[PDB]
Structures are given as C-alpha cells and as structure tokens.
Write an enzyme that holds these catalytic residues in place. Structure first.
Site, PDB file in Angstrom:
ATOM      1  N   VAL A 113       0.834  -1.199   0.000  1.00 28.90           N
ATOM      2  CA  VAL A 113       0.000   0.000   0.000  1.00 28.90           C
ATOM      3  C   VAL A 113       0.872   1.253   0.000  1.00 28.90           C
ATOM      4  O   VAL A 113       2.091   1.167   0.164  1.00 28.90           O
ATOM      5  CB  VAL A 113      -0.973   0.023   1.196  1.00 28.90           C
ATOM      6  CG1 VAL A 113      -2.151  -0.897   0.916  1.00 28.90           C
ATOM      7  CG2 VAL A 113      -0.279  -0.370   2.468  1.00 28.90           C
TER       8      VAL A 113
ATOM      9  N   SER B 217       8.586   0.378   3.489  1.00 27.03           N
ATOM     10  CA  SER B 217       7.496  -0.255   2.757  1.00 27.03           C
ATOM     11  C   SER B 217       6.350  -0.693   3.708  1.00 27.03           C
ATOM     12  O   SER B 217       6.601  -1.269   4.762  1.00 27.03           O
ATOM     13  CB  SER B 217       8.040  -1.453   1.981  1.00 27.03           C
ATOM     14  OG  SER B 217       7.309  -1.656   0.793  1.00 27.03           O
ATOM     15  N   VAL B 218       5.101  -0.437   3.336  1.00 26.43           N
ATOM     16  CA  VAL B 218       3.947  -0.828   4.137  1.00 26.43           C
ATOM     17  C   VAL B 218       3.071  -1.770   3.328  1.00 26.43           C
ATOM     18  O   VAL B 218       2.885  -1.585   2.118  1.00 26.43           O
ATOM     19  CB  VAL B 218       3.155   0.395   4.631  1.00 26.43           C
ATOM     20  CG1 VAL B 218       1.959  -0.035   5.470  1.00 26.43           C
ATOM     21  CG2 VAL B 218       4.084   1.279   5.480  1.00 26.43           C
TER      22      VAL B 218
ATOM     23  N   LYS C  61       4.657  -2.533   8.494  1.00 31.23           N
ATOM     24  CA  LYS C  61       5.768  -1.760   7.943  1.00 31.23           C
ATOM     25  C   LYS C  61       7.056  -2.567   8.095  1.00 31.23           C
ATOM     26  O   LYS C  61       7.404  -2.994   9.210  1.00 31.23           O
ATOM     27  CB  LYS C  61       5.892  -0.407   8.648  1.00 31.23           C
ATOM     28  CG  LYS C  61       7.039   0.517   8.079  1.00 31.23           C
ATOM     29  CD  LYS C  61       7.371   1.624   9.116  1.00 31.23           C
ATOM     30  CE  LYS C  61       6.306   2.689   9.189  1.00 31.23           C
ATOM     31  NZ  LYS C  61       6.823   3.994   9.761  1.00 31.23           N
TER      32      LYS C  61
ATOM     33  N   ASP D 287       2.216   8.388  12.251  1.00 26.46           N
ATOM     34  CA  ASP D 287       3.561   8.772  11.864  1.00 26.46           C
ATOM     35  C   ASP D 287       4.333   9.505  12.959  1.00 26.46           C
ATOM     36  O   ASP D 287       4.496  10.719  12.932  1.00 26.46           O
ATOM     37  CB  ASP D 287       3.509   9.545  10.554  1.00 26.46           C
ATOM     38  CG  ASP D 287       3.092   8.649   9.365  1.00 26.46           C
ATOM     39  OD1 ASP D 287       2.879   7.393   9.511  1.00 26.46           O
ATOM     40  OD2 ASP D 287       2.976   9.210   8.266  1.00 26.46           O
TER      41      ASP D 287
END
Ligand SMILES: Oc1cccc(-c2nnc(NCc3c(F)cccc3Cl)[nH]2)c1
EC number: 2.7.11.24
Length: 343
Positions: free
Chosen positions: A27, A28-29, A44, A159
């Site tokens: 969607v 690194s995730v 993640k 975040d």
C-alpha cells in the site's frame, strides 16, 4: 513460542512474517489480515534499519515511541517481530498497527466539512495530543495526511519518529510545510509542544473552508501569508526570537495588525472562530494547550474530562546519547523481544 514464518516477494523485497498474517498487499507498508485477532493491519518493514548510527538510532526511536502509545486517538503497536533467532542474526524489524480506512488528505481534499464533523475530528486530535503532550512527546509533523479515520469518523494520529525531512522536501509549494508553526519553519527559537497546536489550527481551518490556510509558495511567501492573518510580531515576541538573523529579517517587514477572524471564516460557528484565534497565535507561549482546548465550548458535545486520559511518563533520555550502531541495535532488539501485545 516463536511462530513459524513464511516468505513472500512483494515489489522486489522479501517479506518474512508469522503465519498469522495473511493476504499481504503493498500500500514499505503492506496491508494484511491478522487471522489471530480478526484485525485488518498495516505492516511496515523497516528499510536497512541498522545501516548507520543515524538509522539505527531512528529505528530505536520509532520502536520506543510506538511501544509507548496506548490511546484511542494515537496509532499504537499491535505487534513487532523479526525473523531473527538471535541478536547476531538481527537485521530486520517489522511493525504492525491497525489499518485505518483512509487519511484526511485523501477523504476531505477540496471539501468543507459540516461543523459537527469539524468538532468531532478536531476533538479527537486534541484528545490524542493531550495524551502525547502529557508524556512530553511532540509530534512535530501533524498534517491531514497523517490523520486517519475509520467509517465511524473515529480518528488516529499517525507517523511518529519518522526520518526528518530534507531541505528539498520542505521547499516550494508543498504540504510538507503548510502546517508547520513559523518558529519551526524558520528556526526562530527552541520549539516545544505548542508547535502541534499551530498545526491543529491550520488543519481545523482547512476542514472548515475546504482550503489550505497558509499555502505558501516558499518559506517567505508562507510567512507573509501567516503574518497577514495573525499580525506582525510585537516587541515581546521579537525578544524571544533567539535567532538574531531571523529576528532581524522579520523586523524588516511592514507592520500589520491581526485580522478579524470572523471576516476570514465567514459563516463559521463563532465558537470555532474563537478557538482558531486561540490556536493561531504567533507567540507559542500564548497558544491554547490541548488540555485547555478540550474544555473549550466548541467541544461541549464531546468533552468528557473523565475520558481524556494522560500518558505514562516517557523516558527519551536516549535522544541525548551517542552510541555505536551495535549498541543501538542491541537496545532495539531488547525492545522487540520484550514486546507484549495489547488486549
Ligand atoms: O494514510 C493512510 C491511509 C489509510 C490507512 C493508513 C494507516 N493505517 N494504519 C497505519 N499505520 C502505519 C504505521 C505502520 F504500519 C507502522 C508503524 C507506524 C505507522 Cl503510523 N497507516 C494510512
């Protein structure tokens, strides 16, 4: 006790994850389905978490922050894992969180919201901020793209602990800068928790109008947009700009009074206008705090002083520590193997 892991290549990267996590989709995730909890999750995979001192410390920072957060309106950690079976093998970290439905940037782009939605969304941001600020955690980067919501309008702040932005990323006509308090955007002074309240003001204004509040084409243009609304600084604030060069520049600008916010936010609830005037104060010492804002009459439908909890203390003394890569890696490994999942 160690689960079985399986491997998958996803956009040219090997993901190795416990069997409970299925249907991994970039969607690194990756989005995934946690078959053990029934939860849709975001996973993640950290990129090269121990490649440098700066990266190793950032990996530790993010894990420390996510492990601490336990609040309805803040992203927390459902799981953390590594396929490594020993500290010696440890080179990968995966973080698992709830998968939210969408972020505000994607949902509310170019659109004004009803007043009840502005009340509820800003209430929830402030509730989360009361919690993180009570731990002396500053988000520092609140914007619509790291605020996510589910279909019931429930919101979480996302975040934390991310890599600090490059100069290029903050340059020009960019949302990466539009929500930043002027004292951090121009390095006026040592900043504190109040920078997040400025961002909430910018976000609340945009939810009310459908429009970016301060869409500056660059740092200086944005400052001019800001000072046109809130007025140029007075003598007391100028003394607090410890940056002699920044203080000298802002004194070169023609003085301007604060505008009438009822004429800027035409048609808005007067209680929303009042709250915006109390958030968007140039002097950060004089901005309303999250705890104070939760008690503002704009939130009367939602405020419950018995359900606006504070956080446990958060020890971030590590921030002042200079350690080697393997020392940051060992600290991170201790935090991975000691993780306890939430109920
Ligand atoms: O911008 C959007 C849009 C929709 C969901 C999401 C989302 N939902 N949960 C997350 N968590 C991301 C995440 C991790 F996967 C791991 C550590 C921290 C965070 Cl914020 N993002 C973000």
């Amino acid at each position: 006790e160690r689960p079985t892991f399986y491997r998958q290549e996803l956009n040219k990267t090997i993901w190795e994850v416990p069997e409970r996590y299925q249907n991994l989709s970039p969607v690194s995730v990756c989005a995934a389905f946690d078959t053990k909890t029934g939860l849709r999750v975001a996973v993640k995979k950290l990129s090269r978490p121990f490649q440098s001192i700066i990266h190793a410390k950032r990996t530790y920072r993010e894990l420390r922050l996510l492990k601490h957060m336990k609040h309805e309106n803040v992203i927390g950690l459902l799981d953390v894992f590594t396929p490594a079976r020993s500290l010696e093998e440890f080179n990968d970290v995966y973080l698992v969180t709830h998968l939210m439905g969408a972020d505000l940037n994607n949902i509310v782009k170019c659109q004004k919201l009803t007043d009840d939605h502005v009340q509820f969304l800003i209430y929830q941001i402030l509730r989360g901020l009361k919690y993180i600020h009570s731990a002396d955690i500053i988000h520092r980067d609140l914007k619509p793209s790291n605020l996510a919501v589910n279909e019931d309008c429930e919101l979480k702040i996302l975040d934390f602990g991310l890599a600090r932005h490059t100069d290029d990323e903050m340059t020009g006509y960019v949302a990466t800068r539009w929500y930043r308090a002027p004292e951090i955007m121009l390095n006026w002074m040592h900043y504190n928790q109040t920078v997040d309240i400025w961002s909430v003001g910018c976000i609340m204004a945009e939810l009310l109008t459908g429009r970016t509040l301060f869409p500056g084409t660059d740092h200086i243009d944005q400052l001019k947009l800001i000072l046109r609304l809130v007025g140029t600084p007075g003598a007391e604030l100028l003394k607090k700009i410890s940056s002699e060069s920044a203080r000298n520049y802002i004194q070169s600008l023609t003085q301007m009074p604060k505008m009438n916010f009822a004429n800027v936010f035409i048609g808005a609830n007067p209680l929303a206008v009042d709250l915006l005037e109390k958030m968007l104060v140039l002097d950060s010492d004089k901005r309303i705090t999250a705890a104070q804002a939760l008690a503002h009459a704009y939130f009367a439908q939602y405020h419950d002083p018995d359900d606006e909890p504070v956080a446990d203390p958060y020890d971030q003394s590590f921030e002042s520590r200079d350690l080697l890569i393997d020392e940051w890696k060992s600290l991170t490994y201790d935090e991975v193997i000691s993780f306890v999942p939430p109920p």
